[PDB]
PDB file of all heavy atoms in Angstrom:
ATOM      1  N   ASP A   1      22.991 124.855 113.204  1.00  0.00           N
ATOM      2  CA  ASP A   1      23.029 124.427 114.607  1.00  0.00           C
ATOM      3  C   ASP A   1      24.073 125.099 115.482  1.00  0.00           C
ATOM      4  O   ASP A   1      24.110 124.856 116.685  1.00  0.00           O
ATOM      5  CB  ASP A   1      23.269 122.916 114.712  1.00  0.00           C
ATOM      6  CG  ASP A   1      22.032 122.098 114.439  1.00  0.00           C
ATOM      7  OD1 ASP A   1      21.408 122.246 113.368  1.00  0.00           O
ATOM      8  OD2 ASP A   1      21.688 121.289 115.319  1.00  0.00           O
ATOM      9  N   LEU A   2      24.949 125.905 114.902  1.00  0.00           N
ATOM     10  CA  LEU A   2      25.930 126.556 115.744  1.00  0.00           C
ATOM     11  C   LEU A   2      25.241 127.669 116.482  1.00  0.00           C
ATOM     12  O   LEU A   2      24.551 128.474 115.880  1.00  0.00           O
ATOM     13  CB  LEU A   2      27.076 127.175 114.936  1.00  0.00           C
ATOM     14  CG  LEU A   2      27.968 128.066 115.821  1.00  0.00           C
ATOM     15  CD1 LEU A   2      28.585 127.214 116.921  1.00  0.00           C
ATOM     16  CD2 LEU A   2      29.046 128.766 114.993  1.00  0.00           C
ATOM     17  N   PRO A   3      25.379 127.709 117.802  1.00  0.00           N
ATOM     18  CA  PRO A   3      24.772 128.750 118.615  1.00  0.00           C
ATOM     19  C   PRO A   3      25.610 130.020 118.473  1.00  0.00           C
ATOM     20  O   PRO A   3      26.816 130.037 118.752  1.00  0.00           O
ATOM     21  CB  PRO A   3      24.872 128.182 120.016  1.00  0.00           C
ATOM     22  CG  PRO A   3      24.997 126.698 119.763  1.00  0.00           C
ATOM     23  CD  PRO A   3      26.012 126.730 118.677  1.00  0.00           C
ATOM     24  N   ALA A   4      24.956 131.081 118.029  1.00  0.00           N
ATOM     25  CA  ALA A   4      25.601 132.364 117.844  1.00  0.00           C
ATOM     26  C   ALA A   4      24.748 133.393 118.565  1.00  0.00           C
ATOM     27  O   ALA A   4      23.537 133.225 118.654  1.00  0.00           O
ATOM     28  CB  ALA A   4      25.660 132.681 116.381  1.00  0.00           C
ATOM     29  N   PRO A   5      25.360 134.462 119.096  1.00  0.00           N
ATOM     30  CA  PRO A   5      24.609 135.493 119.798  1.00  0.00           C
ATOM     31  C   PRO A   5      23.623 136.120 118.811  1.00  0.00           C
ATOM     32  O   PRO A   5      23.936 136.266 117.627  1.00  0.00           O
ATOM     33  CB  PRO A   5      25.702 136.452 120.227  1.00  0.00           C
ATOM     34  CG  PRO A   5      26.850 135.562 120.387  1.00  0.00           C
ATOM     35  CD  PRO A   5      26.773 134.828 119.100  1.00  0.00           C
ATOM     36  N   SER A   6      22.438 136.474 119.303  1.00  0.00           N
ATOM     37  CA  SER A   6      21.378 137.056 118.493  1.00  0.00           C
ATOM     38  C   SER A   6      21.763 138.414 117.969  1.00  0.00           C
ATOM     39  O   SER A   6      21.567 138.761 116.810  1.00  0.00           O
ATOM     40  CB  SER A   6      20.150 137.181 119.366  1.00  0.00           C
ATOM     41  OG  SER A   6      20.529 137.751 120.605  1.00  0.00           O
ATOM     42  N   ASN A   7      22.314 139.190 118.872  1.00  0.00           N
ATOM     43  CA  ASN A   7      22.726 140.537 118.585  1.00  0.00           C
ATOM     44  C   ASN A   7      24.142 140.563 118.080  1.00  0.00           C
ATOM     45  O   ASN A   7      25.078 140.423 118.848  1.00  0.00           O
ATOM     46  CB  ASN A   7      22.657 141.320 119.862  1.00  0.00           C
ATOM     47  CG  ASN A   7      23.388 140.624 120.957  1.00  0.00           C
ATOM     48  OD1 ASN A   7      23.087 139.469 121.271  1.00  0.00           O
ATOM     49  ND2 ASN A   7      24.367 141.293 121.537  1.00  0.00           N
ATOM     50  N   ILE A   8      24.308 140.757 116.783  1.00  0.00           N
ATOM     51  CA  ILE A   8      25.640 140.820 116.212  1.00  0.00           C
ATOM     52  C   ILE A   8      25.730 141.750 115.006  1.00  0.00           C
ATOM     53  O   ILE A   8      25.047 141.585 113.996  1.00  0.00           O
ATOM     54  CB  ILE A   8      26.146 139.404 115.876  1.00  0.00           C
ATOM     55  CG1 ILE A   8      27.098 138.943 116.976  1.00  0.00           C
ATOM     56  CG2 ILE A   8      26.791 139.372 114.505  1.00  0.00           C
ATOM     57  CD1 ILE A   8      27.681 137.601 116.723  1.00  0.00           C
ATOM     58  N   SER A   9      26.598 142.735 115.137  1.00  0.00           N
ATOM     59  CA  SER A   9      26.782 143.717 114.105  1.00  0.00           C
ATOM     60  C   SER A   9      27.626 143.202 112.972  1.00  0.00           C
ATOM     61  O   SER A   9      28.246 142.146 113.076  1.00  0.00           O
ATOM     62  CB  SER A   9      27.407 144.974 114.714  1.00  0.00           C
ATOM     63  OG  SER A   9      28.664 144.711 115.298  1.00  0.00           O
ATOM     64  N   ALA A  10      27.637 143.970 111.887  1.00  0.00           N
ATOM     65  CA  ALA A  10      28.398 143.633 110.690  1.00  0.00           C
ATOM     66  C   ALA A  10      29.824 143.286 111.053  1.00  0.00           C
ATOM     67  O   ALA A  10      30.451 142.412 110.450  1.00  0.00           O
ATOM     68  CB  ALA A  10      28.385 144.803 109.728  1.00  0.00           C
ATOM     69  N   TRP A  11      30.327 143.972 112.064  1.00  0.00           N
ATOM     70  CA  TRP A  11      31.682 143.768 112.514  1.00  0.00           C
ATOM     71  C   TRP A  11      31.916 142.325 112.871  1.00  0.00           C
ATOM     72  O   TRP A  11      32.999 141.947 113.293  1.00  0.00           O
ATOM     73  CB  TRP A  11      31.963 144.728 113.667  1.00  0.00           C
ATOM     74  CG  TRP A  11      31.857 146.117 113.161  1.00  0.00           C
ATOM     75  CD1 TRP A  11      30.760 146.683 112.613  1.00  0.00           C
ATOM     76  CD2 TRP A  11      32.925 147.039 112.952  1.00  0.00           C
ATOM     77  NE1 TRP A  11      31.068 147.891 112.059  1.00  0.00           N
ATOM     78  CE2 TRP A  11      32.395 148.135 112.252  1.00  0.00           C
ATOM     79  CE3 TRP A  11      34.284 147.042 113.282  1.00  0.00           C
ATOM     80  CZ2 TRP A  11      33.167 149.226 111.875  1.00  0.00           C
ATOM     81  CZ3 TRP A  11      35.062 148.131 112.906  1.00  0.00           C
ATOM     82  CH2 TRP A  11      34.495 149.209 112.208  1.00  0.00           C
ATOM     83  N   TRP A  12      30.891 141.511 112.690  1.00  0.00           N
ATOM     84  CA  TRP A  12      31.058 140.124 112.958  1.00  0.00           C
ATOM     85  C   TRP A  12      31.152 139.376 111.653  1.00  0.00           C
ATOM     86  O   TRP A  12      31.561 138.224 111.619  1.00  0.00           O
ATOM     87  CB  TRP A  12      29.937 139.623 113.837  1.00  0.00           C
ATOM     88  CG  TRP A  12      30.431 139.355 115.215  1.00  0.00           C
ATOM     89  CD1 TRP A  12      30.977 138.199 115.677  1.00  0.00           C
ATOM     90  CD2 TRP A  12      30.551 140.297 116.263  1.00  0.00           C
ATOM     91  NE1 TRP A  12      31.433 138.365 116.951  1.00  0.00           N
ATOM     92  CE2 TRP A  12      31.181 139.652 117.335  1.00  0.00           C
ATOM     93  CE3 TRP A  12      30.189 141.629 116.402  1.00  0.00           C
ATOM     94  CZ2 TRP A  12      31.458 140.293 118.528  1.00  0.00           C
ATOM     95  CZ3 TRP A  12      30.461 142.264 117.584  1.00  0.00           C
ATOM     96  CH2 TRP A  12      31.090 141.599 118.636  1.00  0.00           C
ATOM     97  N   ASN A  13      30.800 140.028 110.559  1.00  0.00           N
ATOM     98  CA  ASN A  13      30.920 139.354 109.284  1.00  0.00           C
ATOM     99  C   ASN A  13      32.389 139.257 108.989  1.00  0.00           C
ATOM    100  O   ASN A  13      32.869 138.198 108.586  1.00  0.00           O
ATOM    101  CB  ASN A  13      30.218 140.119 108.186  1.00  0.00           C
ATOM    102  CG  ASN A  13      28.724 140.243 108.434  1.00  0.00           C
ATOM    103  OD1 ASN A  13      28.284 141.014 109.276  1.00  0.00           O
ATOM    104  ND2 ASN A  13      27.934 139.452 107.714  1.00  0.00           N
ATOM    105  N   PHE A  14      33.108 140.360 109.194  1.00  0.00           N
ATOM    106  CA  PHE A  14      34.553 140.352 108.972  1.00  0.00           C
ATOM    107  C   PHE A  14      35.094 139.101 109.628  1.00  0.00           C
ATOM    108  O   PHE A  14      35.092 138.970 110.856  1.00  0.00           O
ATOM    109  CB  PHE A  14      35.167 141.592 109.580  1.00  0.00           C
ATOM    110  CG  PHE A  14      34.667 142.824 108.956  1.00  0.00           C
ATOM    111  CD1 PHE A  14      33.933 143.725 109.678  1.00  0.00           C
ATOM    112  CD2 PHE A  14      34.874 143.053 107.610  1.00  0.00           C
ATOM    113  CE1 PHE A  14      33.406 144.844 109.062  1.00  0.00           C
ATOM    114  CE2 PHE A  14      34.352 144.157 106.994  1.00  0.00           C
ATOM    115  CZ  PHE A  14      33.617 145.055 107.719  1.00  0.00           C
ATOM    116  N   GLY A  15      35.536 138.179 108.783  1.00  0.00           N
ATOM    117  CA  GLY A  15      36.018 136.897 109.256  1.00  0.00           C
ATOM    118  C   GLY A  15      35.452 135.900 108.271  1.00  0.00           C
ATOM    119  O   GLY A  15      36.172 135.127 107.633  1.00  0.00           O
ATOM    120  N   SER A  16      34.136 135.923 108.143  1.00  0.00           N
ATOM    121  CA  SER A  16      33.501 135.064 107.173  1.00  0.00           C
ATOM    122  C   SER A  16      34.012 135.646 105.855  1.00  0.00           C
ATOM    123  O   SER A  16      34.276 134.927 104.897  1.00  0.00           O
ATOM    124  CB  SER A  16      31.983 135.184 107.269  1.00  0.00           C
ATOM    125  OG  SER A  16      31.557 136.506 107.014  1.00  0.00           O
ATOM    126  N   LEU A  17      34.176 136.964 105.823  1.00  0.00           N
ATOM    127  CA  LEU A  17      34.688 137.639 104.643  1.00  0.00           C
ATOM    128  C   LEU A  17      36.126 137.215 104.489  1.00  0.00           C
ATOM    129  O   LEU A  17      36.536 136.718 103.450  1.00  0.00           O
ATOM    130  CB  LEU A  17      34.651 139.136 104.841  1.00  0.00           C
ATOM    131  CG  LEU A  17      33.259 139.641 105.141  1.00  0.00           C
ATOM    132  CD1 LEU A  17      33.387 141.100 105.487  1.00  0.00           C
ATOM    133  CD2 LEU A  17      32.309 139.400 103.942  1.00  0.00           C
ATOM    134  N   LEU A  18      36.893 137.434 105.547  1.00  0.00           N
ATOM    135  CA  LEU A  18      38.294 137.071 105.548  1.00  0.00           C
ATOM    136  C   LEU A  18      38.468 135.714 104.909  1.00  0.00           C
ATOM    137  O   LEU A  18      39.457 135.457 104.224  1.00  0.00           O
ATOM    138  CB  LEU A  18      38.812 137.074 106.971  1.00  0.00           C
ATOM    139  CG  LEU A  18      38.950 138.516 107.420  1.00  0.00           C
ATOM    140  CD1 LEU A  18      38.947 138.610 108.885  1.00  0.00           C
ATOM    141  CD2 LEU A  18      40.236 139.075 106.844  1.00  0.00           C
ATOM    142  N   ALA A  19      37.497 134.841 105.122  1.00  0.00           N
ATOM    143  CA  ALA A  19      37.563 133.523 104.522  1.00  0.00           C
ATOM    144  C   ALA A  19      37.521 133.701 103.017  1.00  0.00           C
ATOM    145  O   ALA A  19      38.479 133.388 102.319  1.00  0.00           O
ATOM    146  CB  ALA A  19      36.395 132.694 104.971  1.00  0.00           C
ATOM    147  N   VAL A  20      36.395 134.224 102.543  1.00  0.00           N
ATOM    148  CA  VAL A  20      36.161 134.487 101.135  1.00  0.00           C
ATOM    149  C   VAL A  20      37.379 135.103 100.472  1.00  0.00           C
ATOM    150  O   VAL A  20      37.577 134.992  99.271  1.00  0.00           O
ATOM    151  CB  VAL A  20      34.995 135.447 100.959  1.00  0.00           C
ATOM    152  CG1 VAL A  20      34.687 135.637  99.488  1.00  0.00           C
ATOM    153  CG2 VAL A  20      33.797 134.924 101.690  1.00  0.00           C
ATOM    154  N   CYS A  21      38.173 135.812 101.245  1.00  0.00           N
ATOM    155  CA  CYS A  21      39.369 136.371 100.684  1.00  0.00           C
ATOM    156  C   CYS A  21      40.301 135.189 100.566  1.00  0.00           C
ATOM    157  O   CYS A  21      40.730 134.823  99.472  1.00  0.00           O
ATOM    158  CB  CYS A  21      39.943 137.415 101.614  1.00  0.00           C
ATOM    159  SG  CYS A  21      38.934 138.840 101.597  1.00  0.00           S
ATOM    160  N   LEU A  22      40.589 134.564 101.696  1.00  0.00           N
ATOM    161  CA  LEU A  22      41.469 133.431 101.674  1.00  0.00           C
ATOM    162  C   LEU A  22      41.161 132.609 100.455  1.00  0.00           C
ATOM    163  O   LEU A  22      42.065 132.135  99.798  1.00  0.00           O
ATOM    164  CB  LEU A  22      41.302 132.583 102.920  1.00  0.00           C
ATOM    165  CG  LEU A  22      42.346 131.469 102.914  1.00  0.00           C
ATOM    166  CD1 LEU A  22      43.724 132.015 102.550  1.00  0.00           C
ATOM    167  CD2 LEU A  22      42.382 130.835 104.292  1.00  0.00           C
ATOM    168  N   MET A  23      39.879 132.460 100.138  1.00  0.00           N
ATOM    169  CA  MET A  23      39.472 131.682  98.968  1.00  0.00           C
ATOM    170  C   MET A  23      39.819 132.412  97.705  1.00  0.00           C
ATOM    171  O   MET A  23      40.688 131.992  96.949  1.00  0.00           O
ATOM    172  CB  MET A  23      37.973 131.386  98.991  1.00  0.00           C
ATOM    173  CG  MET A  23      37.526 130.620 100.213  1.00  0.00           C
ATOM    174  SD  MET A  23      38.233 128.989 100.349  1.00  0.00           S
ATOM    175  CE  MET A  23      40.056 129.265 100.266  1.00  0.00           C
ATOM    176  N   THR A  24      39.138 133.520  97.479  1.00  0.00           N
ATOM    177  CA  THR A  24      39.391 134.324  96.306  1.00  0.00           C
ATOM    178  C   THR A  24      40.887 134.419  96.031  1.00  0.00           C
ATOM    179  O   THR A  24      41.313 134.401  94.878  1.00  0.00           O
ATOM    180  CB  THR A  24      38.809 135.702  96.491  1.00  0.00           C
ATOM    181  OG1 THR A  24      37.402 135.572  96.702  1.00  0.00           O
ATOM    182  CG2 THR A  24      39.054 136.544  95.263  1.00  0.00           C
ATOM    183  N   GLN A  25      41.693 134.509  97.082  1.00  0.00           N
ATOM    184  CA  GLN A  25      43.135 134.569  96.897  1.00  0.00           C
ATOM    185  C   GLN A  25      43.659 133.232  96.413  1.00  0.00           C
ATOM    186  O   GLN A  25      44.314 133.142  95.373  1.00  0.00           O
ATOM    187  CB  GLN A  25      43.831 134.931  98.197  1.00  0.00           C
ATOM    188  CG  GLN A  25      43.564 136.335  98.632  1.00  0.00           C
ATOM    189  CD  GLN A  25      43.713 137.285  97.489  1.00  0.00           C
ATOM    190  OE1 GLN A  25      42.901 137.281  96.576  1.00  0.00           O
ATOM    191  NE2 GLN A  25      44.762 138.090  97.514  1.00  0.00           N
ATOM    192  N   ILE A  26      43.364 132.189  97.176  1.00  0.00           N
ATOM    193  CA  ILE A  26      43.819 130.863  96.819  1.00  0.00           C
ATOM    194  C   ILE A  26      43.270 130.426  95.484  1.00  0.00           C
ATOM    195  O   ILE A  26      43.968 129.849  94.670  1.00  0.00           O
ATOM    196  CB  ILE A  26      43.446 129.842  97.886  1.00  0.00           C
ATOM    197  CG1 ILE A  26      44.184 130.182  99.180  1.00  0.00           C
ATOM    198  CG2 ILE A  26      43.847 128.465  97.441  1.00  0.00           C
ATOM    199  CD1 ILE A  26      43.892 129.281 100.341  1.00  0.00           C
ATOM    200  N   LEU A  27      42.014 130.704  95.228  1.00  0.00           N
ATOM    201  CA  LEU A  27      41.495 130.285  93.954  1.00  0.00           C
ATOM    202  C   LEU A  27      42.216 131.054  92.838  1.00  0.00           C
ATOM    203  O   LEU A  27      42.897 130.443  92.019  1.00  0.00           O
ATOM    204  CB  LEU A  27      39.992 130.530  93.878  1.00  0.00           C
ATOM    205  CG  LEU A  27      39.324 129.713  92.784  1.00  0.00           C
ATOM    206  CD1 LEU A  27      39.254 128.288  93.280  1.00  0.00           C
ATOM    207  CD2 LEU A  27      37.934 130.249  92.484  1.00  0.00           C
ATOM    208  N   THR A  28      42.093 132.384  92.817  1.00  0.00           N
ATOM    209  CA  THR A  28      42.726 133.187  91.770  1.00  0.00           C
ATOM    210  C   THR A  28      44.218 132.923  91.665  1.00  0.00           C
ATOM    211  O   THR A  28      44.714 132.585  90.604  1.00  0.00           O
ATOM    212  CB  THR A  28      42.535 134.694  91.993  1.00  0.00           C
ATOM    213  OG1 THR A  28      43.164 135.068  93.219  1.00  0.00           O
ATOM    214  CG2 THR A  28      41.063 135.054  92.067  1.00  0.00           C
ATOM    215  N   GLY A  29      44.939 133.065  92.765  1.00  0.00           N
ATOM    216  CA  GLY A  29      46.368 132.840  92.705  1.00  0.00           C
ATOM    217  C   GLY A  29      46.827 131.472  92.220  1.00  0.00           C
ATOM    218  O   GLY A  29      47.859 131.325  91.569  1.00  0.00           O
ATOM    219  N   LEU A  30      46.066 130.451  92.572  1.00  0.00           N
ATOM    220  CA  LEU A  30      46.371 129.086  92.188  1.00  0.00           C
ATOM    221  C   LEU A  30      46.307 129.047  90.687  1.00  0.00           C
ATOM    222  O   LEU A  30      47.077 128.378  90.020  1.00  0.00           O
ATOM    223  CB  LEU A  30      45.288 128.177  92.728  1.00  0.00           C
ATOM    224  CG  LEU A  30      45.463 126.690  92.534  1.00  0.00           C
ATOM    225  CD1 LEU A  30      46.569 126.204  93.498  1.00  0.00           C
ATOM    226  CD2 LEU A  30      44.140 125.989  92.826  1.00  0.00           C
ATOM    227  N   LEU A  31      45.357 129.805  90.183  1.00  0.00           N
ATOM    228  CA  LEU A  31      45.039 129.916  88.777  1.00  0.00           C
ATOM    229  C   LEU A  31      46.005 130.836  88.048  1.00  0.00           C
ATOM    230  O   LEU A  31      46.274 130.684  86.871  1.00  0.00           O
ATOM    231  CB  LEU A  31      43.622 130.442  88.726  1.00  0.00           C
ATOM    232  CG  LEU A  31      42.843 130.706  87.482  1.00  0.00           C
ATOM    233  CD1 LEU A  31      42.755 129.458  86.658  1.00  0.00           C
ATOM    234  CD2 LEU A  31      41.479 131.186  87.927  1.00  0.00           C
ATOM    235  N   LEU A  32      46.543 131.788  88.779  1.00  0.00           N
ATOM    236  CA  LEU A  32      47.463 132.746  88.211  1.00  0.00           C
ATOM    237  C   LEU A  32      48.819 132.071  88.155  1.00  0.00           C
ATOM    238  O   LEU A  32      49.675 132.416  87.343  1.00  0.00           O
ATOM    239  CB  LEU A  32      47.533 133.957  89.129  1.00  0.00           C
ATOM    240  CG  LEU A  32      47.985 135.302  88.591  1.00  0.00           C
ATOM    241  CD1 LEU A  32      46.919 135.841  87.653  1.00  0.00           C
ATOM    242  CD2 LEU A  32      48.168 136.246  89.760  1.00  0.00           C
ATOM    243  N   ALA A  33      49.012 131.107  89.042  1.00  0.00           N
ATOM    244  CA  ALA A  33      50.275 130.385  89.097  1.00  0.00           C
ATOM    245  C   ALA A  33      50.284 129.445  87.924  1.00  0.00           C
ATOM    246  O   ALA A  33      51.315 128.909  87.540  1.00  0.00           O
ATOM    247  CB  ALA A  33      50.391 129.608  90.403  1.00  0.00           C
ATOM    248  N   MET A  34      49.117 129.238  87.352  1.00  0.00           N
ATOM    249  CA  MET A  34      49.058 128.379  86.200  1.00  0.00           C
ATOM    250  C   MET A  34      49.785 129.023  85.042  1.00  0.00           C
ATOM    251  O   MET A  34      50.042 128.373  84.027  1.00  0.00           O
ATOM    252  CB  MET A  34      47.624 128.122  85.778  1.00  0.00           C
ATOM    253  CG  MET A  34      46.918 127.158  86.653  1.00  0.00           C
ATOM    254  SD  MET A  34      45.400 126.679  85.925  1.00  0.00           S
ATOM    255  CE  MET A  34      44.975 125.335  87.153  1.00  0.00           C
ATOM    256  N   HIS A  35      50.107 130.302  85.175  1.00  0.00           N
ATOM    257  CA  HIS A  35      50.790 130.978  84.089  1.00  0.00           C
ATOM    258  C   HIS A  35      52.078 131.693  84.492  1.00  0.00           C
ATOM    259  O   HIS A  35      52.865 132.116  83.641  1.00  0.00           O
ATOM    260  CB  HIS A  35      49.825 131.953  83.416  1.00  0.00           C
ATOM    261  CG  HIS A  35      48.548 131.313  82.988  1.00  0.00           C
ATOM    262  ND1 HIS A  35      47.582 130.914  83.887  1.00  0.00           N
ATOM    263  CD2 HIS A  35      48.111 130.931  81.767  1.00  0.00           C
ATOM    264  CE1 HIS A  35      46.600 130.315  83.238  1.00  0.00           C
ATOM    265  NE2 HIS A  35      46.897 130.312  81.950  1.00  0.00           N
ATOM    266  N   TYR A  36      52.304 131.820  85.789  1.00  0.00           N
ATOM    267  CA  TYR A  36      53.502 132.484  86.254  1.00  0.00           C
ATOM    268  C   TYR A  36      54.737 131.670  85.829  1.00  0.00           C
ATOM    269  O   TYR A  36      54.634 130.482  85.561  1.00  0.00           O
ATOM    270  CB  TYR A  36      53.443 132.603  87.779  1.00  0.00           C
ATOM    271  CG  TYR A  36      54.564 133.424  88.359  1.00  0.00           C
ATOM    272  CD1 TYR A  36      54.668 134.780  88.081  1.00  0.00           C
ATOM    273  CD2 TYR A  36      55.534 132.841  89.159  1.00  0.00           C
ATOM    274  CE1 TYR A  36      55.712 135.537  88.586  1.00  0.00           C
ATOM    275  CE2 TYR A  36      56.575 133.587  89.665  1.00  0.00           C
ATOM    276  CZ  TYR A  36      56.662 134.937  89.380  1.00  0.00           C
ATOM    277  OH  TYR A  36      57.689 135.699  89.902  1.00  0.00           O
ATOM    278  N   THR A  37      55.895 132.317  85.755  1.00  0.00           N
ATOM    279  CA  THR A  37      57.132 131.632  85.404  1.00  0.00           C
ATOM    280  C   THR A  37      58.199 132.229  86.294  1.00  0.00           C
ATOM    281  O   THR A  37      58.861 133.172  85.929  1.00  0.00           O
ATOM    282  CB  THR A  37      57.519 131.850  83.935  1.00  0.00           C
ATOM    283  OG1 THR A  37      56.515 131.286  83.084  1.00  0.00           O
ATOM    284  CG2 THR A  37      58.830 131.187  83.633  1.00  0.00           C
ATOM    285  N   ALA A  38      58.359 131.673  87.478  1.00  0.00           N
ATOM    286  CA  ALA A  38      59.323 132.184  88.446  1.00  0.00           C
ATOM    287  C   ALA A  38      60.778 132.163  88.053  1.00  0.00           C
ATOM    288  O   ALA A  38      61.500 131.224  88.364  1.00  0.00           O
ATOM    289  CB  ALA A  38      59.161 131.454  89.756  1.00  0.00           C
TER     290      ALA A  38
END
């Protein structure tokens, strides 16, 4: 239901990706912290 412009290039994915990074980072790192010893 979110209204988005019809015409949108890949350059618009960057962001949804940025999210997936935020995730991949938070997920992996959270998991990597499970073994880190600061």
Side-chain angles (χ1 to χ4, degrees):
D1 282 55
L2 170 61
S6 47
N7 51 303
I8 259 182
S9 60
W11 297 60
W12 252 272
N13 298 75
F14 298 115
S16 61
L17 302 173
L18 286 159
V20 184
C21 288
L22 185 46
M23 301 297 55
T24 300
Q25 291 314 70
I26 296 179
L27 199 75
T28 62
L30 185 73
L31 181 57
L32 203 69
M34 284 191 172
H35 307 72
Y36 187 65
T37 297

